[PDB]
Ligand SMILES: Cc1cc2nc3c(=O)[nH]c(=O)nc-3n(C[C@H](O)[C@H](O)[C@H](O)COP(=O)(O)O)c2cc1C
Ligand SMILES: Cc1cc2nc3c(=O)[nH]c(=O)nc-3n(C[C@H](O)[C@H](O)[C@H](O)COP(=O)(O)O)c2cc1C
Ligand SMILES: COC(=O)c1cccc(CCc2c(C(=O)O)[nH]c(=O)[nH]c2=O)c1
């Protein structure tokens with residue numbers, strides 16, 4: 001018995017991978033993610049030029065999860081493109097490249113260059129619809145006309161199957177609107193739910209201080225705090241986007257949390273805070289634990305229970 | 314050393330009270346909250362007509378908090394108005410009456426009727442904006458045009474100081490816009506942050522089932538899941554609404570959580586899930602725990618540390 005699967009025309013040894021931004025910034029990180037037992041890896045979201053990101057401390061974790069305001073530090077698109085084109089060993093596992101340009105034009109410029117490497121090598125694209133705050137305007141994925149623009153422009157410029165990383169939604173009307181926008185675009189083959197829960201605030205009682213330096217302590221939350229929000233979003237998109245795959249991200253620390261994502265409809269399962277805290281060994285534990293739940297229930301395949309969460313009456 | 318506060322022209326023995334919807338539906342509930350050591354109580358959010366609410370199970374709790382889709386079950390406005398005018402003992406503690414009409418017209422009708430009792434007895438109004446409007450539109454407080462409408466008409470119909478219960482926000486743009494709307498209305502003297510984190514989904518791994526019946530399992534999240542989100546919202550409004558009070562609500566299980574809310578800027582501190590789970594004995598524990606933290610830090614009153622959370626640099 002094994003957790004092997006095929007999608008987007010690639011084979012994956014198991015449904016696990018890092019979440020974008022975790023253990024994926026440097027050549028050292030990507031090589032370590034490659035050497036792990038993960039099923040796939042995703043590079044850090046990049047911009048055209050390298051960025052240092054925000055002042056430190058800019059990430060902190062706690063028993064129930066993490067807060068970050070990293071500021072999109074990254075080595076620049078040229079570095080991740082070179083990683084995808086010359087350095088990654090595709091015989092080991094698939095690679096996804098996350099892009100997060102600060103304007104539509106910047107995104108269009110990076111995807112035009114990624115297209116022939118995607119054709120030649122099979123690197124897959126994850127378009128990240130989250131960016132640093134611009135006063136007077138909402139996040140792109142919270143502004144449905146801007147979202148529709150980015151997607152129209154990228155699908156035109158890239159011309160190949162790609163995926164989008166979405167922030168969480170909290171209102172049913174927003175699920176219906178966002179999914180309708182995503183469904184206008186046949187090249188969006190996968191949706192990743194969810195990015196960190198925006199602008200939480202952790203305060204330390206002893207020091208009476210916030211715990212990260214940028215943005216007066218405000219930053220995105222991950223880990224145990226966000227599991228039910230992550231499951232709601234995976235399931236909301238699984239139901240509304242029957243012709244796409246959903247990848248689950250948020251709150252995965254155990255094979256049980258992975259099993260819940262898959263029941264909710266997840267095809268791949270990304271690990272962020274728990275990977276940051278435990279290291280790449282977590283992938284062999286997560287495989288063992290999900291296999292163990294499956295055996296106890298009598299499930300031979302992920303397909304037997306994916307998206308089969310039961311409702312009452 | 315003391316927990317006493319005077320606000321809104323009332324005196325409160327301590328900052329604790331129930332969160333609306335918890336232990337406040339019936340006369341029996343309200344007399345219980347009155348007999349407890351809470352500094353105040355708020356009645357269940359009511360509609361003009363009595364409501365049975367959604368089918369059960371519609372609330373469930375777990376180690377890290379709760380999920381609910383109650384559907385606004387309540388005994389109807391006439392009951393809560395009668396409780397405020399004839400039954401509540403104001404010599405014990407102040408009363409807030411929460412209203413949550415299904416349309417602006419229903420809100421307006423309630424508050425015209427409330428107004429004479431508010432002037433005579435001193436009951437204080439909390440208008441719930443984290444509430445359904447027209448289906449397929451977002452809840453009122455996530456639609457800034459509907460929000461401005463509700464506040465204009467309620468200000469006019471009521472003519473007295475009131476407060477508003479707000480859903481959590483996740484994007485800085487929303488904090489900016491929401492506070493600017495609120496700051497248009499000088500009768501809005503307090504803002505309660507936050508209502509439940511909307512449409513999460515809790516799944517039970519053993520049964521492979523959702524845990525509440527309404528809305529295919531989707532429901533509002535409370536408790537340990539939402540503390541950082543609640544602290545962010547309290548601090549964001551404390552900073553942006555310098556002429557208003559902020560009441561904090563979300564994730565309070567201990568005097569230490571209360572202490573964080575107050576450093577974030579909370580005046581009153583409300584207790585929902587932990588109160589539902591532990592019962593009204595929680596209020597003596599919370600007061601003890603908060604006084605111990607204060608004693609250890611040398612704080613003699615709440616004003617010494619309210620709003621004084623430190624940032625880094
Ligand atoms: C330090 C850190 C860096 C991150 N950077 C990115 C990023 O560059 N791109 C992105 O799409 N999401 C990024 N995220 C969000 C994660 O991909 C993930 O969506 C989030 O942490 C929720 O998952 P978790 O509960 O497993 O942490 C980052 C998260 C963390 C904690
Ligand atoms: C069973 C239940 C019923 C609730 N009903 C209401 C309500 O009627 N009006 C309201 O403004 N909020 C209501 N809420 C939200 C609580 O007031 C509170 O905002 C939310 O639970 C967050 O606080 P907590 O983390 O202490 O639970 C309810 C919450 C629960 C769990
Ligand atoms: C609401 O989004 C933001 O505030 C924001 C700020 C800086 C960078 C980004 C994009 C990269 C990113 C980051 C990051 O590099 O700070 N952290 C996350 O949790 N998710 C992300 O997608 C988003």
Ligand SMILES: COC(=O)c1cccc(CCc2c(C(=O)O)[nH]c(=O)[nH]c2=O)c1
Nearest residue numbers: 381382383384385386443444445509533
């Ligand atoms: C028809 O009214 C509703 O179905 C409904 C839905 C969501 C929220 C509300 C307002 C009451 C409320 C409830 C509730 O009664 O379901 N639960 C919460 O966690 N916060 C609330 O403010 C009503």
